[PDB]
Structure formats: structure tokens, C-alpha cells
């Protein structure tokens, strides 16, 4: 329902913040220990970092190259995020692309901090939370069992 969709969207901050910490293992805001690491959503983000490292290296390389060609700053990051994220889902939603979105967010926050020296992980967290809510992705996850479904995506 609308409620379960909203619930997934409310859980995304914790998932993404855990995902980033485990994916990152120089950018200090990614080294900060995650809040509530052993919470269910913390564990979801941990698992998404594993499966992304296993199966999403092609997307990772793509986003690294895109951001090298772009050279986003805090001032234009939102415009690039929106167009790239939107294009990622134009042919539909699947778990591969949900993981890819998180990875794009990680790379965007990393690039912006490393070049402009202003914190940006919190801003990208909001970009990702809002994007999933506004582009039927939280709804799609809710229809498949909520974020806990990401504890059983296929990694061993």
C-alpha cells in the first residue's frame, strides 16, 4: 500500500548509510562508523555492499568513468544525479538497478568530497531517499517484501 511504500522509503537512509560504510572499505564521512550496524536495515545495507561488489562491477566502472568525465561539484551534482538515476530505470526496475543506484550514490558522494572538500554524503543520502520514493522504486521494493528481501538476493 501507500504505507508499505512509505515505510521502505523511511528505511532507505539507514540502508544507504550502512551500504556506504561497507562499500568504502580518502573520504572521512565514509569511514564514520554506521549508526546501529546490527539493526535489520543496517544488515540489509551490509548485504547490498557484498552483492554489489560481486555482481555490479560493470556499473561501478561505468559510474567512475561518468564522474571522471563529469567532474561534479556540490552545485551541479543534483542535476547529474537526477538524469543519470532516471536513465538507469527507464527500461524498468530490478534489483540489479537498485544496487547500481546505491553504488552511483556512493561514487557521487565520494567524488564531490574529494575534489571540493565539502561534505556531501548526507546530501546524496537525501538524493537517494527521495529518488526511490518519487520514482516507484520504494513501491517496487515494498511489493517484493520490503528491504528485508535484500537479505536474500543471491550472494552466498
XYZ file of N, CA, C and O in Angstrom:
624
model
N 0.829 -1.200 0.000
C 0.000 0.000 0.000
C 0.849 1.228 0.000
O 2.057 1.109 0.016
N 0.217 2.396 0.042
C 0.985 3.613 0.254
C 1.811 3.525 1.533
O 2.941 4.018 1.575
N 1.282 2.875 2.578
C 2.003 2.815 3.848
C 3.268 1.973 3.743
O 4.312 2.349 4.288
N 3.190 0.819 3.062
C 4.380 -0.018 2.957
C 5.403 0.605 2.023
O 6.600 0.429 2.217
N 4.940 1.343 1.012
C 5.848 2.083 0.145
C 6.571 3.161 0.939
O 7.808 3.291 0.868
N 5.809 3.929 1.736
C 6.412 4.948 2.578
C 7.368 4.335 3.579
O 8.414 4.912 3.885
N 7.018 3.170 4.118
C 7.905 2.516 5.071
C 9.256 2.169 4.438
O 10.305 2.361 5.061
N 9.250 1.606 3.231
C 10.513 1.330 2.545
C 11.302 2.622 2.373
O 12.511 2.674 2.617
N 10.624 3.698 1.971
C 11.337 4.961 1.789
C 11.939 5.473 3.099
O 13.045 6.015 3.104
N 11.244 5.275 4.220
C 11.770 5.700 5.512
C 12.956 4.850 5.958
O 13.773 5.317 6.761
N 13.057 3.600 5.483
C 14.159 2.714 5.835
C 15.399 2.948 4.984
O 16.450 2.399 5.287
N 15.289 3.746 3.915
C 16.386 3.841 2.955
C 17.594 4.558 3.524
O 18.726 4.189 3.210
N 17.402 5.602 4.331
C 18.558 6.275 4.898
C 19.482 5.294 5.616
O 20.702 5.284 5.394
N 18.912 4.466 6.492
C 19.737 3.535 7.255
C 20.404 2.528 6.339
O 21.578 2.193 6.527
N 19.680 2.047 5.335
C 20.252 1.067 4.407
C 21.432 1.684 3.666
O 22.500 1.073 3.547
N 21.228 2.880 3.099
C 22.267 3.520 2.292
C 23.479 3.873 3.157
O 24.622 3.716 2.728
N 23.249 4.358 4.386
C 24.387 4.757 5.212
C 25.219 3.547 5.619
O 26.448 3.648 5.719
N 24.574 2.389 5.838
C 25.330 1.170 6.106
C 26.042 0.682 4.852
O 27.232 0.348 4.898
N 25.336 0.676 3.724
C 25.926 0.273 2.452
C 27.204 1.049 2.163
O 28.218 0.464 1.758
N 27.173 2.373 2.353
C 28.340 3.193 2.025
C 29.525 2.834 2.900
O 30.674 2.792 2.435
N 29.280 2.628 4.189
C 30.380 2.330 5.088
C 31.061 1.037 4.670
O 32.285 0.952 4.625
N 30.276 0.022 4.349
C 30.895 -1.245 3.961
C 31.480 -1.188 2.556
O 32.522 -1.802 2.303
N 30.854 -0.453 1.638
C 31.399 -0.308 0.288
C 32.730 0.435 0.311
O 33.625 0.133 -0.490
N 32.894 1.387 1.232
C 34.098 2.208 1.230
C 35.319 1.400 1.613
O 36.419 1.645 1.093
N 35.154 0.440 2.499
C 36.265 -0.436 2.863
C 36.815 -1.236 1.669
O 36.061 -1.794 0.844
N 40.496 8.405 0.170
C 40.364 9.221 1.375
C 39.063 10.044 1.388
O 38.920 11.004 0.636
N 38.122 9.664 2.257
C 36.878 10.394 2.419
C 36.325 10.127 3.816
O 35.692 9.093 4.056
N 36.544 11.033 4.761
C 36.249 10.714 6.158
C 34.802 10.418 6.452
O 34.528 9.589 7.323
N 33.850 11.058 5.782
C 32.470 10.776 6.174
C 32.052 9.346 5.834
O 31.038 8.870 6.344
N 32.814 8.642 5.005
C 32.519 7.246 4.722
C 33.183 6.295 5.693
O 32.845 5.109 5.700
N 34.130 6.791 6.483
C 34.809 5.995 7.498
C 34.057 6.035 8.818
O 34.212 5.127 9.635
N 33.225 7.035 9.036
C 32.440 7.113 10.256
C 31.658 5.828 10.458
O 30.991 5.327 9.548
N 31.761 5.279 11.653
C 31.089 4.019 11.919
C 29.590 4.195 11.700
O 29.030 5.261 11.982
N 28.915 3.198 11.154
C 27.486 3.346 10.888
C 26.668 3.346 12.171
O 27.029 2.733 13.175
N 25.553 4.069 12.131
C 24.609 4.027 13.236
C 23.911 2.669 13.230
O 23.479 2.182 12.171
N 23.830 2.043 14.391
C 23.008 0.853 14.584
C 23.431 -0.249 13.576
O 22.593 -0.718 12.807
N 24.695 -0.652 13.577
C 25.145 -1.538 12.491
C 24.435 -2.862 12.454
O 24.280 -3.436 11.373
N 24.008 -3.364 13.602
C 23.353 -4.656 13.698
C 21.830 -4.555 13.634
O 21.151 -5.564 13.800
N 21.279 -3.372 13.381
C 19.849 -3.304 13.103
C 19.541 -4.042 11.808
O 20.427 -4.279 10.993
N 18.259 -4.391 11.605
C 17.895 -5.127 10.403
C 18.299 -4.354 9.151
O 18.831 -4.924 8.197
N 18.002 -3.055 9.114
C 18.317 -2.274 7.918
C 19.825 -2.074 7.788
O 20.353 -1.967 6.675
N 20.536 -1.983 8.914
C 21.987 -1.979 8.838
C 22.523 -3.224 8.169
O 23.469 -3.161 7.382
N 21.936 -4.372 8.489
C 22.375 -5.626 7.911
C 21.989 -5.693 6.451
O 22.705 -6.299 5.647
N 20.843 -5.103 6.098
C 20.465 -5.055 4.687
C 21.517 -4.289 3.897
O 21.966 -4.727 2.836
N 21.905 -3.115 4.398
C 22.914 -2.347 3.694
C 24.228 -3.089 3.596
O 24.923 -3.000 2.594
N 24.596 -3.810 4.650
C 25.810 -4.634 4.600
C 25.738 -5.671 3.487
O 26.714 -5.861 2.738
N 24.595 -6.356 3.358
C 24.470 -7.371 2.320
C 24.486 -6.739 0.932
O 25.050 -7.308 -0.014
N 23.890 -5.540 0.797
C 23.867 -4.914 -0.520
C 25.276 -4.544 -0.963
O 25.593 -4.597 -2.158
N 26.147 -4.227 -0.002
C 27.539 -3.935 -0.335
C 28.255 -5.180 -0.842
O 29.078 -5.095 -1.765
N 27.930 -6.347 -0.266
C 28.520 -7.598 -0.727
C 28.055 -7.897 -2.142
O 28.859 -8.123 -3.055
N 26.747 -7.889 -2.352
C 26.286 -8.307 -3.664
C 26.710 -7.295 -4.721
O 27.032 -7.682 -5.842
N 26.806 -6.004 -4.372
C 27.276 -5.028 -5.343
C 28.715 -5.277 -5.752
O 29.078 -5.139 -6.922
N 29.563 -5.606 -4.791
C 30.943 -5.938 -5.121
C 31.042 -7.204 -5.953
O 31.920 -7.300 -6.815
N 30.155 -8.175 -5.711
C 30.168 -9.397 -6.503
C 29.720 -9.144 -7.944
O 30.389 -9.552 -8.896
N 28.559 -8.519 -8.138
C 27.879 -8.606 -9.425
C 27.756 -7.280 -10.150
O 27.335 -7.265 -11.313
N 28.148 -6.166 -9.547
C 27.883 -4.869 -10.166
C 29.128 -4.078 -10.537
O 29.059 -2.865 -10.693
N 30.253 -4.752 -10.751
C 31.486 -4.049 -11.100
C 31.401 -3.336 -12.436
O 32.110 -2.345 -12.653
N 30.575 -3.818 -13.356
C 30.464 -3.114 -14.631
C 29.804 -1.753 -14.444
O 30.272 -0.746 -14.990
N 28.724 -1.704 -13.675
C 28.127 -0.422 -13.348
C 29.102 0.455 -12.590
O 29.188 1.660 -12.844
N 29.820 -0.115 -11.623
C 30.758 0.696 -10.867
C 31.774 1.360 -11.782
O 32.067 2.560 -11.656
N 32.327 0.596 -12.713
C 33.303 1.162 -13.636
C 32.648 2.236 -14.485
O 33.242 3.290 -14.750
N 31.399 2.006 -14.874
C 30.673 2.984 -15.672
C 30.532 4.296 -14.919
O 30.774 5.371 -15.476
N 30.086 4.233 -13.659
C 29.859 5.464 -12.919
C 31.171 6.162 -12.599
O 31.223 7.389 -12.592
N 32.239 5.408 -12.340
C 33.539 6.046 -12.132
C 33.934 6.856 -13.359
O 34.365 8.007 -13.244
N 33.794 6.259 -14.550
C 34.125 6.954 -15.790
C 33.211 8.138 -16.036
O 33.684 9.206 -16.448
N 31.903 7.968 -15.815
C 30.987 9.084 -15.999
C 31.409 10.264 -15.135
O 31.432 11.406 -15.593
N 31.750 9.998 -13.875
C 32.067 11.083 -12.957
C 33.439 11.676 -13.245
O 33.666 12.863 -12.966
N 34.365 10.877 -13.788
C 35.627 11.435 -14.267
C 35.384 12.401 -15.408
O 36.072 13.421 -15.528
N 34.415 12.098 -16.260
C 34.154 12.982 -17.394
C 33.348 14.183 -16.956
O 33.664 15.333 -17.296
N 32.262 13.928 -16.255
C 31.733 14.982 -15.458
C 32.836 15.226 -14.457
O 33.856 14.528 -14.402
N 32.693 16.244 -13.705
C 33.553 16.455 -12.551
C 32.617 17.176 -11.616
O 32.663 18.399 -11.498
N 31.648 16.451 -11.038
C 30.563 17.117 -10.322
C 31.074 17.887 -9.126
O 32.059 17.506 -8.475
N 30.352 18.960 -8.831
C 30.540 19.752 -7.634
C 29.247 19.735 -6.847
O 28.216 19.268 -7.317
N 29.309 20.249 -5.628
C 28.092 20.369 -4.832
C 27.013 21.151 -5.569
O 25.819 20.904 -5.360
N 27.405 22.048 -6.471
C 26.449 22.925 -7.136
C 25.684 22.239 -8.262
O 24.509 22.559 -8.475
N 26.290 21.296 -8.978
C 25.617 20.652 -10.098
C 25.371 19.161 -9.895
O 24.832 18.498 -10.794
N 25.707 18.624 -8.730
C 25.596 17.187 -8.529
C 24.159 16.711 -8.678
O 23.919 15.623 -9.209
N 23.194 17.490 -8.187
C 21.804 17.057 -8.220
C 21.313 16.882 -9.649
O 20.600 15.919 -9.956
N 21.656 17.822 -10.525
C 21.246 17.712 -11.921
C 21.800 16.441 -12.548
O 21.072 15.697 -13.213
N 23.083 16.156 -12.322
C 23.669 14.949 -12.903
C 23.062 13.698 -12.260
O 22.720 12.731 -12.961
N 22.912 13.707 -10.928
C 22.321 12.567 -10.255
C 20.952 12.255 -10.856
O 20.630 11.112 -11.177
N 20.124 13.289 -11.029
C 18.753 13.041 -11.442
C 18.709 12.441 -12.837
O 17.939 11.515 -13.093
N 19.501 12.974 -13.760
C 19.428 12.479 -15.136
C 20.006 11.073 -15.230
O 19.465 10.215 -15.936
N 21.119 10.827 -14.528
C 21.741 9.505 -14.568
C 20.855 8.476 -13.871
O 20.631 7.375 -14.390
N 20.339 8.811 -12.684
C 19.452 7.878 -11.985
C 18.188 7.589 -12.789
O 17.757 6.431 -12.898
N 17.595 8.618 -13.376
C 16.393 8.424 -14.169
C 16.667 7.505 -15.345
O 15.874 6.589 -15.622
N 17.785 7.727 -16.040
C 18.132 6.898 -17.194
C 18.380 5.450 -16.791
O 18.057 4.527 -17.550
N 18.889 5.226 -15.579
C 19.116 3.869 -15.087
C 17.839 3.038 -15.014
O 17.886 1.813 -15.187
N 16.695 3.666 -14.783
C 15.452 2.935 -14.590
C 14.487 3.073 -15.753
O 13.367 2.564 -15.671
N 14.904 3.703 -16.851
C 13.963 3.975 -17.938
C 13.426 2.702 -18.587
O 12.331 2.717 -19.150
N 14.174 1.608 -18.550
C 13.704 0.342 -19.087
C 13.080 -0.558 -18.024
O 12.783 -1.719 -18.311
N 12.876 -0.053 -16.813
C 12.218 -0.783 -15.750
C 13.093 -0.944 -14.517
O 14.270 -0.589 -14.497
N 12.484 -1.512 -13.479
C 13.125 -1.660 -12.178
C 13.454 -3.129 -11.945
O 12.606 -4.004 -12.151
N 14.679 -3.399 -11.520
C 15.058 -4.706 -10.992
C 16.073 -4.499 -9.870
O 16.501 -3.367 -9.581
N 16.411 -5.588 -9.190
C 17.334 -5.462 -8.070
C 18.729 -5.044 -8.535
O 19.432 -4.320 -7.815
N 19.173 -5.523 -9.712
C 20.474 -5.091 -10.224
C 20.553 -3.571 -10.279
O 21.577 -2.971 -9.940
N 19.481 -2.933 -10.727
C 19.494 -1.485 -10.882
C 19.327 -0.772 -9.560
O 19.842 0.336 -9.404
N 18.594 -1.361 -8.619
C 18.559 -0.804 -7.263
C 19.961 -0.783 -6.658
O 20.399 0.236 -6.111
N 20.691 -1.905 -6.745
C 22.081 -1.924 -6.271
C 22.931 -0.908 -7.028
O 23.770 -0.212 -6.437
N 22.734 -0.809 -8.343
C 23.513 0.142 -9.133
C 23.286 1.570 -8.671
O 24.218 2.382 -8.680
N 22.047 1.902 -8.312
C 21.740 3.246 -7.846
C 22.514 3.568 -6.578
O 23.050 4.678 -6.422
N 22.515 2.640 -5.625
C 23.253 2.855 -4.398
C 24.723 3.088 -4.707
O 25.372 3.933 -4.088
N 25.262 2.328 -5.658
C 26.670 2.448 -5.987
C 26.997 3.762 -6.654
O 28.074 4.322 -6.434
N 26.075 4.259 -7.485
C 26.230 5.565 -8.094
C 26.239 6.636 -7.031
O 27.072 7.551 -7.058
N 25.304 6.538 -6.081
C 25.308 7.472 -4.968
C 26.627 7.478 -4.214
O 27.156 8.540 -3.869
N 27.157 6.293 -3.920
C 28.439 6.211 -3.239
C 29.506 6.945 -4.039
O 30.231 7.797 -3.504
N 29.602 6.653 -5.335
C 30.659 7.275 -6.133
C 30.475 8.788 -6.242
O 31.458 9.530 -6.260
N 29.216 9.267 -6.310
C 28.981 10.708 -6.415
C 29.410 11.425 -5.141
O 30.062 12.480 -5.197
N 29.012 10.883 -3.988
C 29.378 11.497 -2.724
C 30.886 11.497 -2.556
O 31.470 12.479 -2.073
N 31.540 10.418 -2.982
C 32.995 10.340 -2.858
C 33.677 11.383 -3.728
O 34.558 12.120 -3.269
N 33.261 11.472 -4.983
C 33.903 12.420 -5.884
C 33.751 13.851 -5.400
O 34.707 14.635 -5.439
N 32.547 14.225 -4.993
C 32.306 15.615 -4.604
C 33.154 15.984 -3.394
O 33.785 17.056 -3.356
N 33.159 15.137 -2.369
C 34.001 15.444 -1.214
C 35.476 15.545 -1.611
O 36.186 16.471 -1.198
N 35.967 14.589 -2.396
C 37.405 14.540 -2.640
C 37.911 15.734 -3.428
O 39.086 16.103 -3.298
N 37.079 16.322 -4.263
C 37.519 17.461 -5.057
C 37.164 18.819 -4.452
O 37.991 19.730 -4.519
N 35.984 18.976 -3.846
C 35.583 20.256 -3.268
C 35.775 20.403 -1.776
O 35.611 21.496 -1.219
N 36.106 19.309 -1.108
C 36.328 19.282 0.335
C 35.122 19.737 1.162
O 35.286 20.173 2.315
N 33.912 19.643 0.622
C 32.704 19.877 1.404
C 31.965 18.558 1.556
O 31.914 17.750 0.624
N 31.424 18.344 2.749
C 30.670 17.133 2.994
C 29.514 17.010 2.024
O 28.847 17.990 1.683
N 29.287 15.803 1.561
C 28.200 15.611 0.626
C 27.473 14.286 0.777
O 26.506 14.060 0.056
N 27.900 13.411 1.675
C 27.233 12.130 1.827
C 25.795 12.310 2.303
O 24.887 11.621 1.818
N 25.566 13.230 3.248
C 24.217 13.474 3.699
C 23.315 13.978 2.592
O 22.144 13.612 2.522
N 23.842 14.844 1.720
C 23.055 15.329 0.596
C 22.724 14.210 -0.377
O 21.588 14.114 -0.858
N 23.709 13.368 -0.692
C 23.435 12.270 -1.606
C 22.474 11.289 -0.963
O 21.644 10.679 -1.654
N 22.561 11.120 0.360
C 21.607 10.236 1.038
C 20.192 10.717 0.774
O 19.308 9.935 0.389
N 19.975 12.020 0.928
C 18.677 12.600 0.612
C 18.315 12.442 -0.867
O 17.160 12.123 -1.181
N 19.276 12.646 -1.788
C 19.009 12.414 -3.202
C 18.442 11.001 -3.400
O 17.472 10.790 -4.128
N 19.074 10.009 -2.763
C 18.723 8.616 -2.999
C 17.390 8.285 -2.341
O 16.528 7.643 -2.944
N 17.196 8.727 -1.097
C 15.929 8.503 -0.401
C 14.782 9.095 -1.199
O 13.762 8.440 -1.432
N 14.935 10.348 -1.620
C 13.868 10.990 -2.366
C 13.661 10.326 -3.724
O 12.533 10.214 -4.192
N 14.746 9.965 -4.418
C 14.584 9.391 -5.747
C 13.810 8.082 -5.677
O 12.875 7.848 -6.450
N 14.146 7.235 -4.713
C 13.444 5.965 -4.625
C 11.974 6.181 -4.299
O 11.108 5.462 -4.805
N 11.676 7.164 -3.456
C 10.277 7.439 -3.120
C 9.501 7.950 -4.327
O 8.357 7.529 -4.572
N 10.107 8.869 -5.082
C 9.425 9.587 -6.144
C 9.392 8.849 -7.475
O 8.622 9.252 -8.357
N 10.188 7.785 -7.657
C 10.264 7.068 -8.930
C 9.829 5.613 -8.811
O 10.289 4.754 -9.567
N 8.836 5.340 -7.955
C 8.220 3.990 -7.822
C 9.224 2.906 -7.405
O 8.855 1.730 -7.568
N 10.423 3.232 -6.916
C 11.347 2.174 -6.538
C 11.050 1.670 -5.127
O 11.097 0.460 -4.870
N 10.729 2.575 -4.197
C 10.303 2.106 -2.881
C 9.043 1.254 -3.007
O 8.882 0.259 -2.293
N 8.127 1.641 -3.895
C 6.925 0.846 -4.100
C 7.262 -0.553 -4.624
O 6.700 -1.558 -4.156
N 8.181 -0.626 -5.588
C 8.594 -1.901 -6.164
C 9.227 -2.799 -5.118
O 8.945 -4.001 -5.079
N 10.096 -2.233 -4.267
C 10.702 -2.998 -3.187
C 9.627 -3.464 -2.214
O 9.644 -4.611 -1.744
N 8.681 -2.581 -1.885
C 7.634 -2.978 -0.957
C 6.852 -4.144 -1.523
O 6.523 -5.091 -0.800
N 6.598 -4.124 -2.828
C 5.827 -5.201 -3.445
C 6.564 -6.526 -3.387
O 5.939 -7.578 -3.519
N 7.870 -6.497 -3.199
C 8.683 -7.703 -3.200
C 9.096 -8.114 -1.803
O 9.926 -9.009 -1.653
N 8.517 -7.503 -0.777
C 8.766 -7.888 0.593
C 9.509 -6.887 1.432
O 9.902 -7.218 2.556
N 9.712 -5.686 0.939
C 10.409 -4.682 1.713
C 11.912 -4.849 1.600
O 12.430 -5.714 0.893
N 12.622 -3.971 2.301
C 14.075 -4.022 2.231
C 14.638 -5.347 2.737
O 15.718 -5.758 2.307
N 13.932 -6.045 3.634
C 14.449 -7.324 4.113
C 14.631 -8.326 2.980
O 15.414 -9.276 3.107
N 13.901 -8.162 1.869
C 14.117 -9.037 0.725
C 15.558 -8.975 0.245
O 16.060 -9.943 -0.332
N 16.247 -7.875 0.496
C 17.635 -7.754 0.070
C 18.593 -8.564 0.938
O 19.798 -8.587 0.642
N 18.110 -9.206 2.007
C 18.910 -10.197 2.726
C 18.948 -11.553 2.017
O 19.595 -12.483 2.508
N 18.262 -11.692 0.894
C 18.241 -12.938 0.142
C 18.291 -12.669 -1.360
O 17.462 -13.162 -2.128
N 19.297 -11.906 -1.813
C 19.402 -11.580 -3.229
C 20.245 -12.572 -4.030
O 20.202 -12.540 -5.265
N 21.028 -13.417 -3.377
C 21.719 -14.452 -4.114
C 23.131 -14.704 -3.658
O 23.692 -15.775 -3.935
N 23.736 -13.722 -2.997
C 25.106 -13.895 -2.535
C 25.154 -14.985 -1.474
O 24.198 -15.208 -0.729
N 26.280 -15.676 -1.428
C 26.373 -16.897 -0.661
C 26.264 -16.715 0.820
O 26.363 -17.730 1.506
